[PDB]
Amino acid sequence: SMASMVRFTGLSLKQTQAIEVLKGHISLPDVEVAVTQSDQASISIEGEEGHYQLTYRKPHQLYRALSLLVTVLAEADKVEIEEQAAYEDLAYMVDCSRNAVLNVASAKQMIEILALMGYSTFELYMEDTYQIEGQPYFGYFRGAYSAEELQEIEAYAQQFDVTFVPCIQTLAHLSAFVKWGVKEVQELRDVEDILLIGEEKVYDLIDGMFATLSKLKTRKVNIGMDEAHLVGLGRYLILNGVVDRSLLMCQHLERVLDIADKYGFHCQMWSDMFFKLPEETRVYLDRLKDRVTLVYWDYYQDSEEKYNRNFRNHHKISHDLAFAGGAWKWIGFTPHNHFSRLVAIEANKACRANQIKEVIVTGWGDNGGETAQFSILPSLQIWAELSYRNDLDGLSAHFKTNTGLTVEDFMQIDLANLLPDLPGNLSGINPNRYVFYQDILCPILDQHMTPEQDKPHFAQAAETLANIKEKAGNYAYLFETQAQLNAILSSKVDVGRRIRQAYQADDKESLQQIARQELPELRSQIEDFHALFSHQWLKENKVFGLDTVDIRMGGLLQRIKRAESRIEVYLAGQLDRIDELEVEILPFTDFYADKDFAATTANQWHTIATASTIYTT
């Protein structure tokens, strides 16, 4: 609240205003800074004794430069900074399709942080969550962005010289749209989440998609096309018979590119359909690859060489390549910044070795968008540092300048996933989620729990996170949510197992303590978690989509009530056996069976919560 007495020369009014916004995040000292554009480096800062010369190559690089300047002057008077960014473009892609649609205010906040970190580009992943005129079911009750909302977000990014790229889908992954049982929708379908290739009303829809996006200033779009096994194999196969499936994809892509051409767009797409690179089809693939940027996506590999093989294979067919890495926030309620760091380190090496020009960091939200949108800030800074510096020596300090938290403290956000016997190089291991949604009477994940280890882990995490929350400022909400989650998981990780132990030993006093004390308290804790979670959601996202979490959490609460009622019936002598408890628990999955830890990966709510049917007919 003490106003900065910083003094700049060389700025545009655009830049002075941007800086005034960013004073809300960083603290500029009373120094004098001469600013100019120069080709010499991405960023350069020289000087001493309160007088500095700052240059940037691209305008948006001014903002990372200010973060670097703030940071270095806390340690020293004299500055000698020169960064050469490895990537011409560095982007962050938020998932707005998995129920969580980032609200406009939060998009602006994200854009400010991206600018401070060094990102050139902001992207939103929208399957059905943007409005198309004359398609009233596309996005219905999903909080689809209006054209105007998209223009406002894009315009706000432009205030920081950050570009906007919408990421859409032009063939498959349109499940929330295609479910609507009206002729105007069903006539567009092939099978599952896949649109019907060759159908003119499908190309009319796709023309409408580009109509909406042409209202923006950007002329860069990611059109999707990521793997779909059943393309050609549904209503298409009925209407048309067996076709060469790569030829079918080429036909469809050509139509999409012609539409995009009409509205002035250049298209990026996932590289999947070109992995095959029948001669005529080879030639057709080869011709279409020259009109797109291919995106090689990979969130998983633990060594540079594994990426290098794929880069080398991709470069045998196209130089117009981007790499998509991952900020892991798609595995329930809790991110995995730690894993993301591990793979970014190796991915960056390979990107550099292959002279890759563009990196997109993806922020997927699989299966309900339950992880906080701002949970992955450390992963974002990690990629910015690797691009601009090729090392992580400045990560913590820069991150603290930008956020108020050390990177180490922020990364404790991951804790509900960080069970102690896991090796750090395995992905998707997500007890945050499956421990939370598992049933009480029928704990189908119970073989994956290790209470001697897990209970104190979750209990200590709750305390750690509570301490970090006190010093997190405007990010405290993230840690408050996580602290309550960990508190819950500490008892819930084995309540199902302890019920079964008591029941088998005929320990009726313990059964009674569980049904009358522990379980009602667990409910009360989950209710408090629902409230913290809801606060988090509504801060970050539109209201739409929160409904699914209400349904899931309501159902869990009702199942805890059933455990209580079933145990009471039995304690009353009204039942000879509690049948649920006579079923022996098998492994939920063998995916990590080979390994010397019990945890696993389980990331579909509907199979975590019940072995019964719930969506099938």
Ligand X SMILES: CC(=O)N[C@H]1/C(=N/OC(=O)Nc2ccccc2)O[C@H](CO)[C@@H](O)[C@@H]1O
Interacting residue with a second copy among 46, 254, 366, 568 (CB under 8 A): 366
Shortest spacing between CB 365 and ligand X, in angstroms: 7
Q: Which of residues 246-285 bind ligand X (CB under 6 A)?
A: 270
Instruction: For 230, list phi and psi in degrees, rounded to 5.
Output: -95, 15
Q: Which of residues 36-65 bind a second copy (CB under 8 A)?
A: none
Closest CA to 377 of 401, 357, 393, 351: 401
Q: Which of residues 466-495 bind a second copy (CB under 8 A)?
A: none
CB-wise, 273 or 609, nearer to ligand X?
A: 273
Q: Binding residues for Mg ion, how many (CB under 5 A)?
A: 5
DSSP 576: S
Instruction: For 252, list phi and psi in degrees, rounded to 5.
Output: -65, -45
Closest CA to 379 of 361, 357, 360, 403: 361
The pairing of strands 292-297 and 32-37 is unpaired
CB-wise, 137 or 270, nearer to ligand X?
A: 270
Q: Is 51 helix (H, G, I), strand (E, B) or coil?
A: strand
Shortest spacing between CB 531 and Mg ion, in angstroms: 9
CB-wise, 48 or 88, nearer to Mg ion?
A: 88
Please choose which of ligand X, a second copy, Mg ion, none residue 226 contacts, taking the beta carbon within 5 to 8 angstroms, the exact cut-off set by kind: ligand X
- DSSP H or E stretch at residue 613: none
Interacting residue with ligand X among 152, 244, 366, 568 (CB under 6 A): 366
Interacting residue with a second copy among 47, 118, 143, 332 (CB under 8 A): 143
Shortest spacing between CB 95 and ligand X, in angstroms: 7
CA 388 from centre of chain: 23
Give the angle subtended at the CA of 35 by the CAs of 34 and 39, to the nearest 5°: 135
- 364 contributes a contact to ligand X by CB under 6 A: yes
CB-wise, 55 or 601, nearer to ligand X?
A: 601
CB-wise, 85 or 361, nearer to Mg ion?
A: 85
CB-wise, 4 or 175, nearer to a second copy?
A: 175
Please choose which of Mg ion, a second copy, ligand X, none residue 477 contacts, taking the beta carbon within 5 to 8 angstroms, the exact cut-off set by kind: none
- 330 contributes a contact to ligand X by CB under 6 A: yes
Please choose which of a second copy, ligand X, Mg ion, none residue 85 contacts, taking the beta carbon within 5 to 8 angstroms, the exact cut-off set by kind: Mg ion
- Tell me if 358 sits within 8 A of 87, measured CB to CB: yes
What CA–CA distance (Å, rounded) separates 285 from 250?
6
What CA–CA distance (Å, rounded) separates 601 from 130?
32
Q: How many CB atoms lie within 10 A of CB 587?
A: 15
Q: Which of residues 528-567 bind ligand X (CB under 6 A)?
A: none
Residues in Cβ contact with 147 at an 8 Å cutoff, skipping those fewer than 6 apart:
130, 131, 212, 215
What CA–CA distance (Å, rounded) separates 177 from 184?
11
Please choose which of a second copy, Mg ion, ligand X, none residue 605 contacts, taking the beta carbon within 5 to 8 angstroms, the exact cut-off set by kind: a second copy
- 42 contributes a contact to Mg ion by CB under 5 A: yes
CB-wise, 329 or 389, nearer to a second copy?
A: 329
Taking CB under 8 A as the binding criterion, the range among 216-224, 248-256, 260-268, 555-563 that sits at the site for a second copy is: 555-563
- 64 contributes a contact to Mg ion by CB under 5 A: no
What CA–CA distance (Å, rounded) separates 7 from 126?
41
Please choose which of ligand X, Mg ion, a second copy, none residue 344 contacts, taking the beta carbon within 5 to 8 angstroms, the exact cut-off set by kind: none
Shortest spacing between CB 553 and a second copy, in angstroms: 6
Please choose which of ligand X, a second copy, Mg ion, none residue 57 contacts, taking the beta carbon within 5 to 8 angstroms, the exact cut-off set by kind: Mg ion
Closest CA to 230 of 215, 247, 250, 245: 245
CB-wise, 132 or 167, nearer to ligand X?
A: 167
Q: Which of residues 82-101 bind Mg ion (CB under 5 A)?
A: 85
Shortest spacing between CB 538 and Mg ion, in angstroms: 7
Interacting residue with Mg ion among 12, 565, 589, 604 (CB under 5 A): 565
CB-wise, 71 or 373, nearer to a second copy?
A: 373
Q: Binding residues for a second copy, how many (CB under 8 A)?
A: 74
- 547 contributes a contact to a second copy by CB under 8 A: yes
Shortest spacing between CB 381 and ligand X, in angstroms: 21
Closest CA to 422 of 457, 390, 398: 457
Q: Which of residues 148-207 bind a second copy (CB under 8 A)?
A: 175-176, 179-183, 191, 193
Residue 118: which region, alpha, beta or left (left: phi > 0; alpha: psi -120 to 50)? left
Taking CB under 8 A as the binding criterion, the range among 25-33, 154-162, 292-300, 362-370 that sits at the site for a second copy is: 362-370
- Tell me if 124 sits within 8 A of 94, measured CB to CB: yes
Shortest spacing between CB 532 and Mg ion, in angstroms: 13
What the block records as the tokens of 44 is 């350069």
Q: Binding residues for ligand X, how many (CB under 6 A)?
A: 6
- Tell me if 361 sits within 8 A of 386, measured CB to CB: no
**Residue 23, Cβ density class (10 Å: 0-12 exposed, 13-18 middle, ≥19 buried):** middle
What CA–CA distance (Å, rounded) separates 387 from 383?
6
Q: Which of residues 406-445 bind a second copy (CB under 8 A)?
A: 439, 441-442, 444
What CA–CA distance (Å, rounded) separates 124 from 225?
16
Q: Which of residues 240-269 bind a second copy (CB under 8 A)?
A: 242
| 383-386 contacts at long range (C-beta below 8 A, 24 or more positions apart) | 383/90, 383/325, 383/327, 383/344, 383/348, 383/359, 384/64, 384/90, 384/117, 384/118, 384/119, 386/86, 386/344, 386/345, 386/348
Shortest spacing between CB 558 and a second copy, in angstroms: 3
Site string for ligand X, 180-219 (x = CB under 6 A): ----------------------------------------
What CA–CA distance (Å, rounded) separates 501 from 207?
61
CB-wise, 449 or 461, nearer to a second copy?
A: 449
Shortest spacing between CB 364 and ligand X, in angstroms: 3
- What single-letter amino acid sits at 219? R
Interacting residue with ligand X among 297, 477, 544, 597 (CB under 6 A): 297
Interacting residue with ligand X among 46, 152, 199, 226 (CB under 6 A): 226
Q: How many CB atoms lie within 10 A of CB 258?
A: 12
Shortest spacing between CB 535 and Mg ion, in angstroms: 9
Q: How many CB atoms lie within 10 A of CB 350?
A: 22
Positions that interact with ligand X (CB under 6 A): 226, 270, 297, 330, 364, 366
Task: By CB under 5 A, name the binding residues for Mg ion.
Answer: 42, 57, 85, 565-566
